[PDB]
Amino acid sequence: TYQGNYGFHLGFLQSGTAKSVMCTYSPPLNKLFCQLAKTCPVQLWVSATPPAGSRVRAMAIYKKSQHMTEVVRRCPHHERCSDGDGLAPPQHLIRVEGNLAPEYLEDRQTFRHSVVVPYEPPEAGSEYTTIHYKYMCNSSCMGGMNRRPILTIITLEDSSGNLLGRDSFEVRVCACPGRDRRTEEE
Ligand SMILES: [Zn+2]
């Protein structure tokens, strides 16, 4: 995490450990629990607007340093699951929704996957800018994350890739998010 010259940091809609809820954020754990394939409106905040060309990248990494050096990718199952949108490659975990200019990358050196989008200042009347994400594999998929916790890294970079700000949050993709938030909230 690191707010830069722009005060870059993330924001989340408070939903509640209720039921029928498909996505809820836990301020205490700073962890998100969401159902697979459902939209998560994460917010972007800044005290100054980034220069034009600045982008927003979303990468998933493993929380525990023992698995730190392993690329997070969908499990052999979901990988062979026809549930694409026409943009995201079948092997990516984090997809973006709503944006018409998302870019799906794979670092040539680290092999890590990411989704980058153009940074856009908040629309009139809002104080923050939204980006709808989705996870396409459950935390409990064998071959996949396999019960291993992950952390979503959201970085604000300039047109040329330079880091301009970074923030993160742990995430859990489950069928029972609400329950899992409270029965973990402790
Ligand atoms: Zn899976």
Q: In the chain, what are the domains?
A: 1-186 (2.60.40.720)
Query: How many beta carbons lie within 10 A of that of residue 140, not counting itself?
Result: 15
> What's the gap in Å between 96 CA and the centre of ligand 1?
17
Q: In the sheet where 150-157 sits, what is the strand order?
A: 23-26, 31-34, 163-173, 150-157, 55-62, 113-118, 103-106
Q: What six digits make up the tokens of 34? A: 């969401």
- What is the longest distance spanned by two Cα atoms in the chain? 44
Alpha-carbon distance of 122 to 138, in angstroms, equals 31
Alpha-carbon distance of 59 to 116, in angstroms, equals 9
> What's the gap in Å between 10 CA and the centre of ligand 1?
26
Q: Which residues touch 110 (CB under 8 Å, ≥6 apart)? A: 71
Alpha-carbon distance of 186 to 182, in angstroms, equals 8
Label residue 20 exposed, middle or buried (CB < 10 Å: 0-12, 13-18, 19+).
exposed
Please give the helix or strand (H or E) that residue 42 lies within, else none.
strand 40-45
- The experimental method is X-ray
Alpha-carbon distance of 67 to 70, in angstroms, equals 6
Question: Residue 151, SS3?
Answer: strand
141 labelled binding-site residue: yes
- Is residue 74 a contact partner of residue 135, using CB atoms and an 8 Å limit? no
Ramachandran angles phi, psi of 58, nearest 5°: -125, 110
